[PDB]
Amino acid sequence: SMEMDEKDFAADSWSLAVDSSFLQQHKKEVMKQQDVIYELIQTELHHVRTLKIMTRLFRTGMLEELHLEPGVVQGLFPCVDELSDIHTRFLSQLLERRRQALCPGSTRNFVIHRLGDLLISQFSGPSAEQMCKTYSEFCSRHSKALKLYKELYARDKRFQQFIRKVTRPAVLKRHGVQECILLVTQRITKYPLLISRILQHSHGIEEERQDLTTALGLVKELLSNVDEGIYQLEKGARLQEIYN
């Protein structure tokens, strides 16, 4: 992550991020809505950062320092480039919406009144198709990635020393290889929980209540499609085991 965005999302809530003289001018219902919108963006910022750890610390470090067999690194980090593009673009849009909403003379005081339209765009058309195909691929390769990691850690001493070295910093405590993989798989099922709670505090404007209800329906359709498109791959699985 970049320092500018980390400081903007350092507080435990929107009500603690904004100045208290700005907070006091708003109704409690607006503060409740903004607190959940802030959590959505803060968790998306953390999710993009998990993907950057996977591509730039783990993936690139393995290609540059290790002598692994070709196609091994791809098995460990399936679809990470595609996933990083999808989520970095979505995050860019969420952060621009916040930036546009800032008061002149402030880098922290804002209210996002329109979010539903942005969530509909992300979870419909070509961008929904790309998230659906990418998560169907990633989640079907998840078990194989963990087993490949465990195989290399137990048999390759150099790989073992590499892992101990790059995961040693305290900021990486919950971001080892297997932890990053499960963090990515779990991301998509967080969206209906966050959107339903934003919707619960967005009844003031009927257009916004409608857009958030549409977005919620779109995310659930995507999750159901991803769930139905999963079939766990197994390294060295025989054809007979697959067609039975």
Partner: protein
Amino acid sequence: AIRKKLVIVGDGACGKTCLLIVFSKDQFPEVYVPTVFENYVADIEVDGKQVELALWDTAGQEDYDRLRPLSYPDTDVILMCFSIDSPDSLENIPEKWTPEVKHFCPNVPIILVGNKKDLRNDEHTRRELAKMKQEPVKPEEGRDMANRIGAFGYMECSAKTKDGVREVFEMATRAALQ
């Protein structure tokens, strides 16, 4: 320290996300209770042994039967959660959650946990349940269910007051070590 993995399972209304947040945070969430839990690695010392306990939630995965099992690989301890203000969440334990956990996590200890124990003597809770011919889950109903499903043990807590929360995670660490 040795690394152990904990996963919490249970219905959407069981309070599992709140339990993981209150244990992991440090300062109680008096301003905002987060909607979601990402992960956490707790540093725990139990009976003289130091353990790194990785914490995971299955909230959001309840309706997705093919995504949900991806949370199970290499789990060392399962917390099986139900809500004391929801006898329906207790009834879903033996024939929905227990067979799935025994299938994907064979020989992994399960601790059955009764969340929201503060609501056992709440007036609004008792009145709302009385309309549907129900009452808050009794301690003996929790123990008998834990005994019936082959649970390692039965524990109660309140994420709201923090009572019993530390004891649940210390016991889960001991269970993961056996």
